[PDB]
Amino acid sequence: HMKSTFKSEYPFEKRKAESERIADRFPNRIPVICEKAEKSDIPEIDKRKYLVPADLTVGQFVYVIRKRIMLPPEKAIFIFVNDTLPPTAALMSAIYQEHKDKDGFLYVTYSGENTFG
């Protein structure tokens, strides 16, 4: 199966164009994209689109992920950005400011495994 969904629907230029407006819509927001690693064994999300605020932290985002897949408390889920595991106080705001891309939108990834690769 594919990998990207909400970001696969359209090309990049589409996203960049989106963030170009989201900047005039919600400046006090943090556009990100939750994704599930392939190696992972957990259930992949339905779509990759998460508009977290500039207040929500990293340890606060996961929760949102644990909501979609409604993963039980008997499972685990770790975030990964560029193959790096950010802290909890790593305000998603300061995260999307260091993990931003040409498109502007963030690209996070969660996996039941806290491994690298």
Partner 1 sequence: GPHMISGLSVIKQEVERLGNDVFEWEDDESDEIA
Is 78 a binder of partner 1 (CB under 8 A)?
no
Q: Which tokens go with 19?
A: 């963030």
Is 45 a binder of partner 1 (CB under 8 A)?
no
Is 50 a binder of partner 1 (CB under 8 A)?
yes
**3, 26, 16, 95 alpha-carbon torsion, rounded to 10°:** -60
Is 10 a binder of partner 1 (CB under 8 A)?
yes
Rg (CA), the chain: 14
CB under 8 Å to 69, separation ≥6 — which residues?
42, 43, 45, 77
- Stretch of 12-20, 35-43, 71-79, 80-88 contacting partner 1, by CB under 8 A: 12-20
Angle subtended at Cα 99 by Cα 94 and Cα 105, rounded to the nearest 5 degrees = 100
Q: Which tokens go with 86?
A: 């950010």
Considering beta carbons, is residue 15 or 40 the nearer one to partner 1? 15
Considering beta carbons, is residue 11 or 115 the nearer one to partner 1? 11
Judged by the rule CB under 8 A, the positions of this chain that interact with partner 1 are 6, 9-12, 14, 18, 26, 29, 34, 49-53, 56, 60-61, 64, 67
